[PDB]
Each structure stands twice: as structure tokens, then as C-alpha cells.
């Protein structure tokens, strides 16, 4: 309707209810995180700290997931079983990952209660990532000892990263257990991340799907595609900032080097996906802990199959972790092909033009003759516009289902991004 009517309704109709909903759904989790933070600072024995965070994680899983949380509980116990029967092998990663894969597949069979499994898939993904990462860290020799039962459980049920929180390596959780002083930088990080979480939530809900009609005089197929993409991106950024605010409030999420404690846990970078340089930087800046996990474990293990095969295996692992579904396997396959073609085409262009057009910011150690000016700037802006166009075309599916909905939404856009990537690959092959 009218723009003046919409901006009259804006403040009290959407911005206050959305912020109230967010605060109401995160207040108890934040209270429990602060409770464990204050408890772990008193100086209890380590096993009491691990037991306390097991209890806190049980209560958080109950509060969010009423009684179906038992599924997640199984995923923990099973994992420890698989980490106790092969504690002496160099296959800990292989066995834990195969167990996780079998579990998630037998969950995808929809014989279990389907309505709530799709709700718990987030916490289950976090727990599975944690177990696989601990297995592979013990394999490679980065964790010295196989953890005791209570240490492993307090790691999986860490109340800061149980529901939303990102994956943190076993040693990050151990140092979180050790505790740090409550300096003002910690409170600054927690408050900044909470404020940005609420801002991203209200932007996704009450500023994103009403952008081009009201917030811009522009208003269509591509406009609604861009609006859906922006709304989904900012919902994900809400979840990311909330995850880092709840993992920094609990104690974890810090990096120290030579007596310099700096709380710098970052889960997502909105300024690298909303003003992108390339699709590689988009898939890397979308979720930094999950990108690190995928890259390190899956990619560095499957790097024998070849570069492209390893990239496809990484995107298949991502599709499995996030739950197999058409409009997600299709998006992830399109991302695989888009990032591959763009990366390799930009690499050949940077080798031929001897300029800095690499899919990422190259440093001052370049072999590149053209570093600044206008041609480099113009080409990088062209590729950034291409990345925004790809993001719109891909996120158009998550408006505001099955094969029919995906084909419909991608035919309404005349299959633009796929033809663009195909032409880019042809141009790559012609010049090299």
C-alpha cells in the first residue's frame, strides 16, 4: 500500500514485535551462558565445570526442543561410543565421520518424527561437526589425549555453542573452560554482537522484504529476487551474530598471542557478501567456522580425488550437514560450479593480464604488473556485479520447496546465472 501508511505502521507493527520475539527466544540462553561464565570463574575442579556445562546444555536443549532433544542426546552418546571403541586407532576421524554419515542418512529416511528433526538439524549439525573435528584432531596429533567422558560431553554440550553457536575446536573449548578475566573488552564484544544480532533480525524481517516498493523508488522478477536474497542473508547474519554473542558470553571465542587477549570470534562477515569481490569470498565469508571446518577436514582429506572432485565432495558434505533437500542441493551444486568457474577464469585472467584480478585480494608480494588504476578497478567491479547477480539468482528460492518450486523460480529468471557461468567457462576455455 501507500509508503506513508507503511512507514506509519513500521515502528509499532513490525520493529517492536520482531525485537521482542528475538529477545524472548534468546533471553534464557543468554542467562544460562552468563551463569556458566560466572561459575567457571570461581575456580572449581575441571570435571565440575564440564558437568555444569553438560547440565546447562541439557537444560538449553530442553528449553528450545521440548522433549525431542533426546535425538541430539543420542548423537552425543553414540559419538562417545565410537570415540571409545577406536581411541587407539589412527582412524578416529574415519570412524566418527562414517558414524555421523550413517546417523544423518537414517535421519533423512523420515521414519523418525519428521516435524522436529528438521528443527533440531542445527544442533545436530553442530554436535556432529564437533565430534568429527575432535576425531580428526586426535588423528593428526593436534589434540594430545583422547578426552575423558566428562570432558568430551562438556565439549559437545558446551552451553555457549549448543543451540546456535558455531563450531569451536576441542582446544578452544578447553581454554574456555580454563576461564579468562572479565575485562571490559569481553563485555564490549558481547554487547556489540548482541546489538548487531538484533539489528540484523529487524533488518531481515521488517526492512528486507519491503525494500524496493517502499525503501527505494525503483518499483518485477529480479527486484523480488534481490529482496528475498537480502532477507535470507540478514536472517543468517542474525543467527551468526547471536551465535558469536552467545559463544563469547560463555567464555569461548578468544585468541591470545604473547600476552594479548583479544576477543575476535567472527562467524560471518556481512560486508563481504553484501559487497562481494567474488563468489569464493562469499562462500568463505558466509560462515567462517563452517567454512574452516569444511575446508580443513573434508577438503584436506578428499584432496586426493582431485581439486574439482574435492570441491564437489565438500559441497555434498555441506548439503548433508544442512539436510538434503531440493532447492538446497541445487543451490549448492550451482555454487560449486559457479565458484569453480569464476576462480579458474579469474586466475587465468590474472596470469594473462598480469594484473590483480585474483578471486581474492592479492598482497604486495605479487608477480602482478598492474595493481591499481582503473582497469583493475573496473574489472573487479564487473566481477562484483556478477557476484551480486549470482547471489540474487541463487537466493530467489528462499522467498519472504520441491523440484517444481525450484524449476519455477529459476525459469522465471530465464536461467540467467547458469548461462552466464557457462559462457564464462567457454570464454575461459577459448583463452586457454
Amino acid at each position, epitope marked *: 500500500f501507500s509508503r506513508q501508511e507503511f512507514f506509519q505502521q513500521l515502528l509499532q507493527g513490525c520493529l517492536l514485535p520482531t525485537a521482542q520475539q528475538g529477545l524472548d527466544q534468546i533471553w534464557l540462553l543468554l542467562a544460562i551462558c552468563l551463569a556458566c561464565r560466572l561459575l567457571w570463574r570461581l575456580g572449581l575442579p575441571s570435571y565440575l565445570k564440564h558437568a555444569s556445562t553438560v547440565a546447562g546444555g541439557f537444560f538449553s536443549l530442553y528449553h528450545f526442543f521440548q522433549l525431542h532433544m533426546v535425538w541430539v542426546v543420542l548423537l552425543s552418546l553414540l559419538c562417545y561410543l565410537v570415540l571409545f571403541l577406536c581411541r587407539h586407532s589412527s582412524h578416529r576421524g574415519v570412524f566418527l565421520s562414517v558414524t555421523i554419515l550413517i546417523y544423518l542418512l537414517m535421519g533423512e529416511m523420515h521414519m523418525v518424527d519428521t516435524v522436529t528433526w528438521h528443527k533440531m538439524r542445527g544442533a545436530q549439525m553442530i554436535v556432529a561437526m564437533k565430534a568429527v573435528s575432535l576425531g580428526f584432531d586426535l588423528d*593428526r596429533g593436534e589434540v594430545g589425549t583422547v578426552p575423558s567422558p566428562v570432558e568430551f560431553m562438556g565439549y559437545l554440550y558446551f552451553v555457549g555453542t549448543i543451540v546456535f553457536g558455531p563450531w569451536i575446536s576441542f582446544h578452544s573449548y578447553l581454554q574456555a573452560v580454563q576461564g579468562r578475566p572479565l575485562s571490559c573488552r569481553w563485555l564490549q564484544k558481547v554487547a556489540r554482537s548482541l546489538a548487531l544480532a538484533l539489528l540484523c533480525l529487524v533488518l531481515s524481517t521488517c526492512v528486507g522484504p519491503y525494500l524496493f516498493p517502499y525503501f527505494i523508488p525503483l518499483n518485477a522478477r529480479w527486484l523480488r529476487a534481490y529482496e528475498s536474497a537480502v532477507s535470507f542473508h540478514f536472517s543468517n547474519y542474525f543467527v551468526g551474530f547471536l551465535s558469536e554473542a552467545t559463544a563469547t558470553l560463555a567464555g569461548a571465542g578468544f585468541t591470545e598471542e604473547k600476552d594479548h587477549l583479544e576477543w575476535d570470534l567472527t562467524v560471518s562477515k556481512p560486508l563481504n557478501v553484501e559487497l562481494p569481490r567474488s563468489m569464493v569470498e562469499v562462500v568463505t565469508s558466509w560462515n567462517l567456522p563452517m567454512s574452516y571446518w569444511l575446508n580443513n577436514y573434508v577438503f584436506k582429506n578428499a584432496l586426493r580425488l582431485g581439486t574439482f572432485s574435492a570441491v564437489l565432495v565438500t559441497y555434498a558434505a555441506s548439503a548433508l550437514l544442512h539436510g538434503f533437500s531440493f532447492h538446497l542441493a541445487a543451490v549448492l551444486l550451482s555454487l560449486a560450479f559457479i565458484t569453480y568457474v569464476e576462480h579458474v577464469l579469474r586466475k587465468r585472467l590474472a596470469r594473462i593480464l598480469s594484473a590483480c584480478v585474483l578471486s581474492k585480494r592479492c598482497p604486495p608480494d605479487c608477480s602482478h604488473q598492474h595493481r591499481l588504476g582503473l582497469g583493475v578497478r573496473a574489472l573487479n567491479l564487473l566481477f562484483g556485479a556478477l557476484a551480486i547477480f549470482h547471489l540474487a539468482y541463487l537466493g530467489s528460492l528462499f522467498d519472504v520447496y520441491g523440484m517444481a518450486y525450484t524449476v519455477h523460480k529459476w525459469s522465471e529468471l530465464s536461467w540467467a546465472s547458469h548461462w552466464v557461468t557457462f559462457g564464462c567457462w567457454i570464454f575461459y576455455r577459448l583463452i586457454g
Partner: antibody
Amino acid sequence: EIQLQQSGAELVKPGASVKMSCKVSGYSFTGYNMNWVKQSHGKSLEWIGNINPYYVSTNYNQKFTGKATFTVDRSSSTAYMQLDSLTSEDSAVYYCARSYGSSHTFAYWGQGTLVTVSS
Amino acid sequence: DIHMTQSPASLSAFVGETVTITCRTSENIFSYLAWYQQKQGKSPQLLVYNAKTLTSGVPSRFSGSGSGTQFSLKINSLQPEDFGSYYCQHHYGSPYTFGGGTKLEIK
């Protein structure tokens, strides 16, 4: 009985490269990380790195990266470490030590290979 | 990485006496420490792991203790086969560092 038979001593010219060897007998070669450790003459021990024989991924000490490279041979169940550009300070005794399964404490050690760099 | 300060550098006693070696850790390692014994000319042997657990074969007179950043190894009734160098090595996580050593001799 576990036994890590480690190759003989080497006398290398400065700037050249050396390649130790550690033949494992007594257990499944691809079931435990193989650690490589360096000890100066009468000084403390230094953990060069390790190699996982199942998947050949290695894990180096940053002080020894680019200096030592680990390889394996499952057909002969033998782990090799190659040192590159041996300075006069690389004359030491190098041990191969198997991890104690669960822990990464070095349960079974070799006998040591003496690397001496001179002219 | 983690720096391990082992003390004393030298230590001498009589056959049957009791000695104690200390290992201070630069960081907190959650009682992840091993004690190795290396005699004159041989390779080290793992005596203690997890800062408290004796291995299969080592006599019961070796006693490990400590936690956090302070650990100790106590040897009661020194026998002639117990005089060598002793190294404390953390197995918290890579890179695993050792201690300076403690040359136990007879005087």
C-alpha cells in the same frame, strides 16, 4: 615385540641433504602416528614432527618446517625423514618414536641415527 | 608454543635415597604430562603419562604428581638402575615440547 629399526649414521657435507629411515616391525604400520624427534649432543629433545601412516597427512613443528619432510612406505612398512640444506647445527641424533595410541606420548622409540655435518 | 622449565639441571644422591624433579609449564596443560628416562647412550623410555599414571613395567617407586602448571616426579629408594636423564614432555597438543632435563648421578 615392537621394534623400530632405524638406519645407520650419516656424515653429510654442509648444504647437502640426508634421508633417515625407520623400518617398523611388530604392529600394523598404518595404525599409529610416527613421530620424528631430534636430540642434540647431550641436550634436550626436540619434536620434529609426525606422519599419520593411514592417510599420509603430516604435522610438522614450525621450527622445523621446510627443513624436514616425512614419507612412508606401506609395502615395506618404513618411515623416512629427509633433511634439506644441513647446517653445521643439524649434527644430532634423530629418533623415530611411535605414539602410545590414545595419548601422543612416545611409547616405543628407535635407537637413533647420528647425523654429522662436517668437511 | 609451550615452554617447559625442568629443575634442577643436575641432581645427585645415594643408592636408596629419595629425589624429586620439578617441571613448571608456561601454560595450563590440564595434567597432560609425561616423564621419560634416558640412560647413557640409549633411547628414552616412557615412565609416566597423564602426570600420574605409571606405564606397564616401570616399578612402583616412581610417583608422578601435580597439575596445572606445576608437576613433580618423586623417586623413592634410588636403585643403581635409576640414574639417568629425565625429561618432562607435555602431550596437550602439537607442537609437543620437552624439558631441559635432569641428569641424576651418584655421589
